[PDB]
Amino acid sequence: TTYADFIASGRTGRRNAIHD
Amino acid sequence: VKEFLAKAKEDFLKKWETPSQNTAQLDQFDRIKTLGTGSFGRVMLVKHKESGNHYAMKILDKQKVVKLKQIEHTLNEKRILQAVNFPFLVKLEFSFKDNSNLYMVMEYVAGGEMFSHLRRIGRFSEPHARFYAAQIVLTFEYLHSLDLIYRDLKPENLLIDQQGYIQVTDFGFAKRVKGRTWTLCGTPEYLAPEIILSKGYNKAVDWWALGVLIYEMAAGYPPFFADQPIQIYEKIVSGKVRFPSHFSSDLKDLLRNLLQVDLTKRFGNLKNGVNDIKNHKWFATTDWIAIYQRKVEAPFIPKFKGPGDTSNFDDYEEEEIRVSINEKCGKEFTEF
Ligand SMILES: O=S(=O)(c1cccc2c(O)nccc12)N1CCCNCC1
Known about the structure:
The complex is a heterodimer of chains A (20) and B (336). Chain A is an all-alpha fold and 20 residues long. Chain A is built from one helix and no strands. In chain A, 0% of the residues are buried. Helices cover 32% and strands 14% of the residues of chain B. In chain B, a hairpin with a 4-residue loop joins β2 and β3 (53-61). In chain B, 42% of the residues are buried. Chains A and B meet through α1 of A and loops of B. 1-(1-hydroxy-5-isoquinolinesulfonyl)homopiperazine (HFS) is lined by residues 35-36, 38, 43, 56, 58, 90, 106, 108-109, 156-157, 159, 169-170 of chain B. Chain A: Keywords: Acetylation, Protein kinase inhibitor.
């Protein structure tokens, strides 16, 4: 399921901004 | 509306033109705990000894700000934050600096980050999401009317206050710009196609981000997610989005208009401005005035075991606050 894929992804934690 | 905005703009400009500075000292506060962390420094729960009030103090290492070339964005943040004033915007109580740091004392919002609650509960019901969305809609109408662009909307930057309402915090990328800008900034999942394609943009990016937020609050996950940022940008520019089978027809429509790759047909960026959004079906039950006044009943009220409680925030390692005996980056932060 989409939900499952998301939970197994490495981006479920607090996401940082990009400066560059 | 137009009448309101008009006055709000006059108040903003007075402070914008003449910002305040050095309105407190580090020793007027008691460092209690780290509430969150950033790239240039940590946000700490602090206590104003004199008033006995609690504040969220954002600390920025001047040298690190310079190494990351975030000087102007930092000045932008303090200058803008000290001049704005809206119900859903966290207030900056004091600001000051010392040999090595910059400080911004904001109001402490005990409720916690939407992020925490949203990730824990999984997803919000549409009505619940409509509640927060409405608040962002007005907050952007406010900000944009001031020629400001927020540029970093996301669950992580939205706090829930004691009344269950939203408080936008972190103006690290906010900018007052008439016309268009080109800086590549924001959070991957929330970036507008324009930004990713380095084509120069405007307020329209804030509306696209709104779409992303509403979708994440309603689905429990972003409309575009992958393991590496580059994979995310590829999804974003492809102008291809999939909606959960439970999304109402109205919701899907509002989102197809927000996550519009064509700036020519994206809600918020048309002749009807924000009204194309306020007057959208999905917001039919929404009484905008009632929302701005905070008369509507909050669907969720985070409770706290008293003042100073940080049970709604994660735990971070405690880093001591060291202040060089020598002034650092003085000329670069003169106006702070
Ligand atoms: O400075 S923050 O907006 C922030 C975090 C935690 C509690 C706060 C609080 O209670 N008030 C104002 C801002 C606060 N921040 C943490 C740094 C990373 N950006 C996301 C949120």
